[PDB]
Symmetry: D2
Subunit: 498 residues, 4 copies
């Protein structure tokens, strides 16, 4: 039981040497320089996130170039993720550029674009034409990240709602609007997003973090916009509202990965419900073997302070115990004073959580929910992980060109590193969002085609020795195809390191 496992935990024992979980860092003025990014990489960053909510293509090109240069210098493969602005609802403008409200204030809100630029205390504009179908009397409209909240008293005409102001607040021009619990019908890709996706495709980003995904259809529109040239870029869907949570099964099916985007989510749904969504969404991703990222305010106070609060430490540990492949930093690295320290703390917390995890509980739980019969590559990957537990293997080694087989092994949550020998550099970069995996690049143009695997296996076992995962005489579990089967791995071997 979990309870029995807890009572036997020790704070004194040595922790795991090899960190399994992965860290996504948002780049900003604290961290954009090549030097700063090197240090972020040494501290534990695996994926650099560009938040296209702010900043021009020029700003972000600089992030791209610097990330590549810092990674080249250190000889790391660092993923690059483009996180979209996404669609939004916002208010219009206000007379004099601001207005203040008091509890009890009655205010009309209108979708009549006549009122767009002349917002007053009496009446102002929201740029969502379907507003009066989307929220009904007694429902709420949140303004400005949920900070001001309105209750809908009545619908006055097909374009106007009379509302009750719930708290003191001062609005300025074009604040954000949330319609918590309401279906919101907006394109998956704005016109800005297209330009932003086109840039990403041209600069060779490894993955998109797609904002405000509500339906599987929207995932497909994002994939369509990426086009032929972007067909290999991961789409990681951001679950940010009740629709995303409701539709999660088909959203997972259509995505490469999920981000539990807790910031907007905890505005769209009651904040205390974010823990339920988080647990559910992470476990649902674990079950199908797709990467999941937990995001937003994990180590927030380290934006200004050199150590984290007690709540923050438990937050990161618990994301890891819930099952998340990745955890994410936003403000903490984009603009905070302690970018390296916050990454270093995150890394250490991940390692403690990992070391406190019961080896085999995840493996068994995940395996017990798979449909039988499995595909043969999945039988091979799950049983390779089992056989790793049986021999206390110190590493596993898999050949994967697309990354598929690596993610399939990570799905079964071994307790050791998964060394992936790949022939694609973008695969190295993309596997950064997958728990346990460490990539080595095999250059087939330079070394030859390796139909019999032996060079790639050699390279992987050499890597394992070099990086101190295992040494001579240790068993390594090795997964690839035999000499004739193409397209997936049908073979597992236990090999002693020479």
């Amino acid at each position: 039981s979990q309870l029995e496992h807890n009572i036997g935990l020790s704070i004194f024992e040595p922790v795991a040497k090899h960190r399994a979980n992965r860290i996504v860092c948002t780049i900003g003025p604290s961290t954009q320089s090549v030097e700063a990014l090197k240090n972020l990489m040494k501290s534990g960053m695996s994926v650099a996130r560009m938040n296209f909510s702010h900043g021009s293509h020029e700003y972000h090109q600089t992030t791209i170039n610097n990330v590549r240069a810092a990674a080249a210098e250190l000889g790391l493969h660092i993923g690059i993720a483009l996180d979209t602005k996404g669609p939004e609802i916002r208010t219009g403008l206000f007379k004099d550029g601001e207005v203040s409200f008091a509890p009890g204030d009655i205010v009309c809100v209108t979708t009549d674009p006549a009122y767009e630029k002349v917002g007053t205390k009496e009446k102002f504009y929201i740029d969502y034409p379907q507003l009066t179908n989307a929220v009904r009397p007694g429902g709420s409209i949140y303004v400005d990240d949920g900070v001001m909240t309105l209750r809908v008293v009545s619908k006055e005409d097909d374009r106007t709602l009379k509302c009750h102001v719930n708290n003191h607040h001062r609005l300025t021009d074009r604040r954000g609007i949330n319609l918590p619990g309401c279906e919101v019908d907006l394109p998956a890709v704005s016109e800005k997003d297209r330009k932003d996706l086109e840039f990403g495709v041209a600069q060779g980003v490894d993955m998109i973090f797609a904002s405000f995904i509500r339906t599987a259809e929207q995932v497909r529109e994002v994939r369509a916009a990426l086009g032929e040239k972007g067909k290999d870029i991961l789409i990681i869907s951001k679950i940010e509202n009740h629709q995303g949570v409701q539709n999660i099964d088909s959203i997972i099916e259509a995505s490469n990965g999920i981000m539990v985007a807790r910031g907007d989510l905890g505005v769209e749904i009651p904040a205390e419900k974010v823990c339920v969504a988080q647990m559910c969404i992470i476990s649902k991703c674990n079950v199908v073997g797709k990467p999941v990222i937990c995001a937003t305010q994990m180590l927030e106070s380290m934006t200004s302070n050199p150590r984290p609060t007690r709540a923050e430490v438990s937050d990161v540990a618990n994301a890891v115990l819930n099952g998340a492949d990745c955890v994410m930093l936003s403000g903490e690295t984009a603009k905070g004073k302690y970018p390296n320290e916050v990454v270093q703390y995150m890394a250490r917390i991940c390692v403690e959580a990992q070391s406190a995890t019961h080896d085999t509980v995840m493996f068994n739980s995940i395996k017990n929910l798979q449909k039988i019969p499995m595909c043969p590559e999945e039988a091979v990957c799950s049983s390779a992980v089992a056989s790793a537990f049986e021999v206390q293997a110190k590493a596993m080694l898999v050949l994967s060109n697309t990354g598929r087989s690596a993610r399939l092994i990570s799905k079964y949550r071994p307790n050791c590193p998964i060394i992936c020998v790949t022939t694609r550099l973008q695969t190295c970069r993309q596997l950064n969002v997958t728990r346990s995996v460490v990539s080595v690049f095999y250059d087939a143009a330079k070394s030859g085609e390796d139909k019999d695997k032996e060079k790639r296996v050699k390279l992987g076992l050499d890597f394992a020795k070099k990086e101190k995962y295992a040494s001579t005489g240790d068993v390594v579990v090795v997964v690839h195809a035999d000499h004739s089967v193409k397209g997936y791995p049908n073979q597992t071997r236990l090999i002693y390191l020479p």
Copy 2:
């Protein structure tokens, strides 16, 4: 499995109607008035904590009096906890009330009280007279929640250490000092602690939160300071150093319960190890059926903001999922701007985590670890909980005078309230630290002996109806003695509400 349970969670189901977990609030200037206490109680405070780190006896006397008046107005039993100063260490005062340090600012710290008032960038006072024994050259001194550290360059003399300041910090007055891994030989009951405890006994406090407990022996010292008249006051040992964690088993055996005192703990040991300690301590308490409180920085940001962070909500939810009876607030209610709201958030988060909990996993895990044969009262209480599950009982009802039988039922973690009819007001107040329990007072002096239990049972069934736990036709599981047995409950009944 946990995983299978997780994937079934919904954010759209109704939540539990009756909150099982319990909230401890620290009283300060925000919260000491009768009016403010009433509102804390309305918001969900079950125990008021007085922090004897600060304030005179007169100040706390006002807290005691105000809590009793508030509670009597609302008709509630609110526990009162005296939290000791203990072996605390602090700076003196400073020139102007703050000094500012830069990394490498060589600084003299002195045990000599002549510098108490008059601290400066180059010399200040610390109130631990054996300082220059406890920490030698090369050692480190942690200042104000470990935010600033000083490496000891050298011993100037028996009263004075020359220190290297290691990082940027602006220092306020009387800040806390930790010396992790140092030989600190201070009493668990100082002279000042002894007077505090005697004050507590005189004023009839329900429980002690005993700071810095390191050994079972120290628990017994606190018990001896409480003396003959203090013998029924609970001793909740606060685990907040390395030794406390080492000695947790015997500390638990000696105490009536435990606090995971994460604030000091996360300076005394590395912060990232706190999550492991927490998990281990909470589960060890659950296994023996003793109350356990998770403390410190749970909703920290709500000291100044109207909403908590995503990490803070998670922290509360997970302490509950960990198995904690109680969660605690410190500065959030003592001195924050939103004391009522922070308690209300905590309550909502508790109920959410409670509703996300698998019914029977705790019951089974805890039961599977108990020595067979059990004592009859434990066989009775655990099988009463099992029957509650089998019939989907909406409440249980137990007669308990000491509180033992209520705590024995709560040990098996039913999913419904436990209505406890008790003959002692102090039992009502002390059972505030026990998950699920709701107390009703039966005045045996005023109402008679009740040998056949019928008066107390009726009082309990009527309470169940009034507080809307159950209605006519609902089955209730009722635990007390038959007509002969004295000293424990030997009987369970299922009873339809009349």
Copy 3:
């Protein structure tokens, strides 16, 4: 696991002192005398079975009278069971009163009653009018307990089947016919059976063993034939063919109990399938908490030999491990040379099987398959058994007038005796088919009405002491109602024996 439980078994340890399973013995010329029946009772017989396939009402009246006299002499309550002849299909007669067949012989079989008395090698009569709808070409007809088998080659007209003889055999007049795998539409109660049921009702038999039950409807016709005066007599349905197995759920629902009548069953279905039916039927009875008897050839060789074969010993042990309340002797006691010895061996084998049973596996398995919410009496009975395991109770004690609550406790398979204090002597007799139960009679006419239970509880605890189930200072789990609830037990107590 079962496997782990096995590897820790010891042949050397002491076996259980109190035999839980029960033995049904068929009475015949070896065993009909009062003396013989006394010895059968001392050897371990709980239920005397009268096989109304043979013998007149006069013969059976003698069994009834002698059973009662022997039981009175010993002060035991012995159940009396009337086992019906039941409906049958048989051949007609043969010329010269016999005929011999050889493999390959072609024979017409007809339902034309013209041919009833003139059976030849060429053609003979079977008295089942629906024969040519019931078996199709390629199907089989078994004659004479399956000893000769015919293959149906073709249907010649609506009353005649041309058949192929499969083995050497000699038929005499009116042999038994089985149509294996065929639905057989015959009344549940023949005209003989009515007379036999009327006798049983008038002589006060405790239970019917109803032969050849195929459908729930037939159970109801047997209950109808027993009438008002027989409404309290148990109906134990004999599963003897494929329909019975197919319809087992609704047959269990309609019966009081089941007998796995393996003799006819292993004729009607392939003999190797009888083990599958047995396991299934027993487990299905365990799950609903109704008594099940395993019957036929269990110790067959002891009909002539003074000790059993190795197969026979495993047969009885395995019936007990499968979950059967009772095991049965037929020829072994009706006409065998070693009636006492065979009962004594059976008893010893039951005790070994019982002692090798994992205490709590059954309890948990059975409980995990009950629908929630349970009725309250069932919650009380299952949790009483749980609490017996928790305290290693040496006995339980239940007040039951109809036997219902006793059977409800036995359903959860405690490892100790269940002492039932009843107010009905027929309940004492009927509880003989229920595992673990030992009855004591409370004479309410003679001792008074005992609304507060205390006399019946006294009598039960005295009994427990007398019969050496427990002694002073041992815990006994005691189940009945509280002082107001009528019609079922809503209360459990743990009581120390004074």
Copy 4:
């Protein structure tokens, strides 16, 4: 649970197509001809047992020769077992070839061979010269499968005991004698056993069934009598006395497998304890992955009847459900009237029990008991079985030369056949005692070395197709070494049949 599995069983589903369990038949006059052996083999005999209790070397030489000729005609590998006489004890001969005893017939038994031929109601011979040491006055002497017992009234002299006959028995010639609980110091290898074993080695028998093994030391004695040329012959230790059961752990560790020799066992210990011993011994063998045979009186009545009893069918089914690799026939085939039919019933019953077995309960129970870390070959074999389950493989295929790897796969109890391609004919024959395994011989001298395994794998895949285990498109789980590793299998592949 077992219970839940049971209630789901159906008698109407198709049964398994490939019988996993194995049948050992004893050869005698019924079965010694080439023709009769062919038919036994066709009926499902996998191992022929020669019982060296009886017959000369010439007689058994005929058995050996006839088995090889039968097997070669049918193209089968049939194991040949030599079952030793061992420390047997028997009566001499009698006046007329039988005497009859009555309870209380005082009778003299003598070690003096002068009475060997000429035994009578008042004096007869027993062939154990130390009789009057081994059993003293008050002791008991068990005669002919314990059917008759004699209490020793007194020691007449060193050669003679005066006995009280205790029950009715008619005594035939050379009947068996047991002296349970008596000090019997006879060799495990008598002089006569030594010549028998040497004969066996000369004639190339595949295995020894070693009677009356009591200690690991005795196993080592049998091994030493087999000498250098006999070192690869399996030693199956027969457990048939009290000490054998006591010492089962070390006896198992010393042997290649075990027989539960229920005939002698059930006289040496009380008969009802045999079921416990059986369960314990079989499971201990399963846990270490050594072959285990259940023996004696399984289908006893079929010695003279065409159909078995309900107990006998049950006995076979439960030995299989217990976990036994093999079940055995003695008199049933040696000297019975229906040798072919009794083997056919046994086969059908095996397949029925096999089909009633929960797929994966054995796999998990056995795996959960193994020491971690495993050897690589065991991690490979157990995870190969798990992948077979995951893909619903219709066969596995293993290369094994010694048989070790085939037995290691069979230890984890897959539900499909295990096709073993071996380079040793003797391995083919010895793997007949291992559940599931079907052997194909690869002649490396004739066909070449096969370093890359492709010849043997093809031979195995073609066999799978021919024997209808799988067809084109079916996945098969294939276990051998990769191209480098020698001495064990380190590799698993899933392969679609071409």
